[PDB]
Structures are given as structure tokens and as C-alpha cells.
Design an enzyme around this catalytic site. Sequence first.
Site, PDB file in Angstrom:
ATOM      1  N   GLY A 166      23.875 -18.536  81.325  1.00 53.71           N
ATOM      2  CA  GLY A 166      25.276 -18.810  81.643  1.00 53.71           C
ATOM      3  C   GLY A 166      25.983 -17.727  82.438  1.00 53.71           C
ATOM      4  CD  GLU A 201      20.552 -26.856  87.793  1.00 53.97           C
ATOM      5  OE1 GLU A 201      19.368 -26.493  87.643  1.00 53.97           O
ATOM      6  OE2 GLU A 201      21.394 -26.794  86.871  1.00 53.97           O
ATOM      7  CG  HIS A 236      27.834 -19.115  78.774  1.00 57.17           C
ATOM      8  ND1 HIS A 236      27.183 -20.208  79.304  1.00 57.17           N
ATOM      9  CD2 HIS A 236      29.036 -19.054  79.394  1.00 57.17           C
ATOM     10  CE1 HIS A 236      27.953 -20.775  80.215  1.00 57.17           C
ATOM     11  NE2 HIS A 236      29.083 -20.096  80.289  1.00 57.17           N
ATOM     12  CD  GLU A 288      18.748 -20.368  81.831  1.00 58.20           C
ATOM     13  OE1 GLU A 288      18.585 -19.134  81.732  1.00 58.20           O
ATOM     14  OE2 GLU A 288      19.860 -20.890  82.056  1.00 58.20           O
ATOM     15  NE  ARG A 292      15.366 -13.665  75.434  1.00 62.84           N
ATOM     16  CZ  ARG A 292      15.919 -14.402  76.397  1.00 62.84           C
ATOM     17  NH1 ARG A 292      15.384 -14.441  77.612  1.00 62.84           N
ATOM     18  NH2 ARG A 292      17.011 -15.110  76.143  1.00 62.84           N
ATOM     19  NE  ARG A 338      22.053 -16.542  67.924  1.00 61.19           N
ATOM     20  CZ  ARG A 338      21.761 -16.132  69.154  1.00 61.19           C
ATOM     21  NH1 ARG A 338      22.358 -15.062  69.666  1.00 61.19           N
ATOM     22  NH2 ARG A 338      20.856 -16.790  69.870  1.00 61.19           N
TER      23      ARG A 338
HETATM   24  N1  LIG Z   1      23.572 -28.553  85.726  1.00 59.25           N
HETATM   25  C1  LIG Z   1      24.117 -28.068  84.583  1.00 59.25           C
HETATM   26  N2  LIG Z   1      25.018 -28.806  83.884  1.00 59.25           N
HETATM   27  C2  LIG Z   1      25.563 -28.336  82.747  1.00 59.25           C
HETATM   28  C3  LIG Z   1      25.195 -27.078  82.270  1.00 59.25           C
HETATM   29  C4  LIG Z   1      25.733 -26.554  81.090  1.00 59.25           C
HETATM   30  C5  LIG Z   1      25.323 -25.287  80.663  1.00 59.25           C
HETATM   31  C6  LIG Z   1      25.866 -24.660  79.417  1.00 59.25           C
HETATM   32  C7  LIG Z   1      25.072 -24.514  78.278  1.00 59.25           C
HETATM   33 BR1  LIG Z   1      23.288 -25.129  78.231  1.00 59.25          BR
HETATM   34  C8  LIG Z   1      25.583 -23.912  77.130  1.00 59.25           C
HETATM   35  C9  LIG Z   1      26.891 -23.445  77.106  1.00 59.25           C
HETATM   36  C10 LIG Z   1      27.687 -23.582  78.237  1.00 59.25           C
HETATM   37  C11 LIG Z   1      27.175 -24.182  79.387  1.00 59.25           C
HETATM   38 BR2  LIG Z   1      28.311 -24.342  80.884  1.00 59.25          BR
HETATM   39  C12 LIG Z   1      24.393 -24.580  81.433  1.00 59.25           C
HETATM   40  N3  LIG Z   1      23.972 -23.346  81.064  1.00 59.25           N
HETATM   41  N4  LIG Z   1      23.885 -25.111  82.571  1.00 59.25           N
HETATM   42  C13 LIG Z   1      24.266 -26.337  82.999  1.00 59.25           C
HETATM   43  N5  LIG Z   1      23.743 -26.845  84.140  1.00 59.25           N
HETATM   44 CL   LIG Z   2      17.054 -14.541  72.792  1.00 59.65          CL
END
Ligand SMILES: Nc1ncc2cc(-c3c(Br)cccc3Br)c(N)nc2n1
Ligand SMILES: [Cl-]
Length: 446
Positions: A166, A201, A236, A288, A292, A338
Site C-alpha cells: 500500500g 490497474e 494498510h 503482489e 518472506r 495483533r
Molecule cells: N487494483 C487494486 N484495487 C484495489 C486495491 C486495494 C488495495 C488495498 C488493500 Br489489499 C488493503 C488495504 C487498502 C487497500 Br487501498 C490494494 N493494496 N491494492 C489494490 N489494487
Molecule cells: Cl509481514
Amino acid sequence: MLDKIVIANRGEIALRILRACKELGIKTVAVHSSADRDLKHVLLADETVCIGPAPSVKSYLNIPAIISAAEITGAVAIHPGYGFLSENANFAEQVERSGFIFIGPKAETIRLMGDKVSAIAAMKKAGVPCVPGSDGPLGDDMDKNRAIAKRIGYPVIIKASGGGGGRGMRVVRGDAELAQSISMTRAEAKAAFSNDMVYMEKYLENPRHVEIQVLADGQGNAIYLAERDCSMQRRHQKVVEEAPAPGITPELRRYIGERCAKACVDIGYRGAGTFEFLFENGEFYFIEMNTRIQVEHPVTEMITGVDLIKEQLRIAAGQPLSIKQEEVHVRGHAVECRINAEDPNTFLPSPGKITRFHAPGGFGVRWESHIYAGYTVPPYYDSMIGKLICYGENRDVAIARMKNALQELIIDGIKTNVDLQIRIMNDENFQHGGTNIHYLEKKLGL
Ligand SMILES: Nc1ncc2cc(-c3c(Br)cccc3Br)c(N)nc2n1
Ligand SMILES: [Cl-]
């Protein structure tokens, strides 16, 4: 089996690694900052080396000092844990160059996964479903960038290739903001990662964060160990994780798991790894990969019976995986809370001395922490001081046990998120299950 390893980390994960080493008869070298002399794992270690002062740059990120500690003790391997240098390909490179085993994948593989553009390209090629996107870096041609956004469809998200978790991303909802949003993400990426490469994306509005645990050895075996739902998060930062993910059928698990394991074979992956997905409308979308072992690994251990850290060590020693895919079975349910030394109102780290401590116990209760009565939490590092993991025959029992365990947990002298965790366990939407990544922040806002 490895004779002696350096545990290149601190806190709970260093203790986690130490226990695994002791079970396998591996000698331990605890490298620590001057502020971490009284860490539980340091006190339990076979050998200790103070590698520098409190700030991480001169201790836990200090590559020459960590390698020198391995040299002077006669250690054969280095376990990076999570955070710090665990995803540093240059460090992994230097470790192997110096003749020590890096407990993780090849440096090339770490480098590939740290390049989010190249990682997605490799996964898409392997057959792993990804987010509809630019399929490559964005250039400076804004006519082309608008065309890409049109082809994808708004909303879109701009992401830094050198980013992750994030870091360095922004949502674009129309043409009018695209140019500035690309430029800013690029500038932030250049300042933070010395890599200005960005990609695009399709922005998913309300997904769940679902990740697949993998293990791969040097004998060509690659297995998947179900999934984790990590959607209960704030800005995040994961707060609660669980395994398996609610609503995920054995059919879906099999579908996405087999594709992750096949990808491991294709890329020549080695060690533990995590494929992160967005899960929305019964569909998976890869974002992604982490190379680790992660904070939330214990929930996977509870439902599979597989000791993941011990598997890492076995893999590094040149041993095959102790289990086959047909031997991997999801049983019961695990939830992880956590525990953070943090202020309830600001969410800033709240360091200080613990004056009274008591850990919960009982059937299905697992406490992962270095903290003790009289221990001072230093201000120099992450706020997470512990992990409470509860297992049950079903999700409801796991949650019920967590509620009881959180009520037994005493941490006085410092501010913690224990009360918040209790509120989450008692949340009707969480109790139903399947809440999205945005739920917690909305709950706290109301
Ligand atoms: N294409 C997208 N569409 C939505 C998302 C959403 C997240 C995300 C996640 Br997986 C967790 C917390 C906040 C956010 Br903004 C991310 N890390 N990546 C993303 N990619
Ligand atoms: Cl981690």
C-alpha cells in the site's frame, strides 16, 4: 541440518525463529541493538552479538555488521524474519556471496517480486489471474495513458513498481485527475524508492484481501497451504487475520492454490512465500508476492499442522518438504489478533515499561510474544509487541476462544489495542464474516 544460524531480527519473530531452531537442534546467534539486550530470545540464545546502537540503520539494517556476526560466530545461515532486510535482494546477494545461506529464495527471485511490474508479468505468464491493468510501465505520453485508462475503465489505481503493501499509490476516478495523479505517484516513488516506474490497474472498490501461503523446496516440490483473510485492517496495517477465508469453498481454494504452486515451479521459487490477491465477486486478482515468512503465518500453521519456520530451515538445509499436497488438509479455523503498543486515540506507537504482564492460556490458545513483566518496549521499532492466535473446530469457536483469551491478557504500564481487538471480536459483521478491506476504518469513523 544447519549447525548454526544468525537470527537477523528482533521481538516476537526472533523468538519464533529461535524456538524452531531449538526444536531442530540448530545453534542460535542472536544479533541485537544496544536497546535490545534484554529481549527474551536474546536471553535464550546460545550466542549473542551486539551489532550496533538502537537506530535500525546501524543495527538491524546494518548489512556489514550482520554478516560479520555470522563470520565471527561460525554461523552457516541467516534468517531475516519479516521487515528489515527480509525483502532486500542486495542483502541476500551479499549473504550468499560471503558464503552463508540466506533463508529465503534466490536473490534474483526476491528482485523479481520486488519489481511489481515484472512480478505481475511473470504471474500472468504462469497462468495466475491478475488485475486488469496496463501490463507494463506507464510512459510520459498522456494520450496513451488516457487510452489505457479508457480500455481498463474508471476507477483506476496508479501504483509504484518499487512500492508494495500500500506504499505509493493513488486512485484515479476521471481523466481530469490522471495526469497529476501519475506525476505525483512517480515523484513519490522517485523520492522513496529511487525508482520512478509506475503502472495502472482497475481499481476494485470493495475487495477482500486474501493471500495464499506456499512452500517450495530445492527438489522441485511446491505446495499451497490454503489462504488467509487479512481484510480487517487500518491504513494498510493488518489488525486481524484469519484462516481459512470465510466463504471460500474447497473448489476455489484448489483452483487458486494449484495456480500459485504452478507459478512457483515456473519461476523456480524456493522457501516460504505468499501470493497476495484481491478477492471480489468470487474472483481472485493477484497484486503482489511476498518472499518472506510473514507476521500472520501462525494462522496457516494452526489449520494445516505445518510448522512453517521449521520448513524454511529444512528447505535451506537441502531437505525436501516434510509434507506432500495430498497430505495438506484444512482443519478447523484460526484467528490472529495483533497486539500493538499504541495509543487508542492517535494510533501512534506508545512505548514504555510493562509493569504487570499475564498471558492467556487454554485449549486452542497460542501466544506469540517476547514481552514480560518488567520489559521496556523501545521507541525505535514497530508497535506490534505480540500476537494472540486462537484455534477452534470452527470459526465461531475460534472467535469465542479469542474473546476469552483477550480478557485474560493483562498488559499494564503501556497503552495497547487489546480493548479495540475485543470490540472487533464482538462486532456482528465480523461475527458474520466476509467484511471487506474498508470495514474497520468505517466502523471507527462511526
Ligand atoms: N487494483 C487494486 N484495487 C484495489 C486495491 C486495494 C488495495 C488495498 C488493500 Br489489499 C488493503 C488495504 C487498502 C487497500 Br487501498 C490494494 N493494496 N491494492 C489494490 N489494487
Ligand atoms: Cl509481514
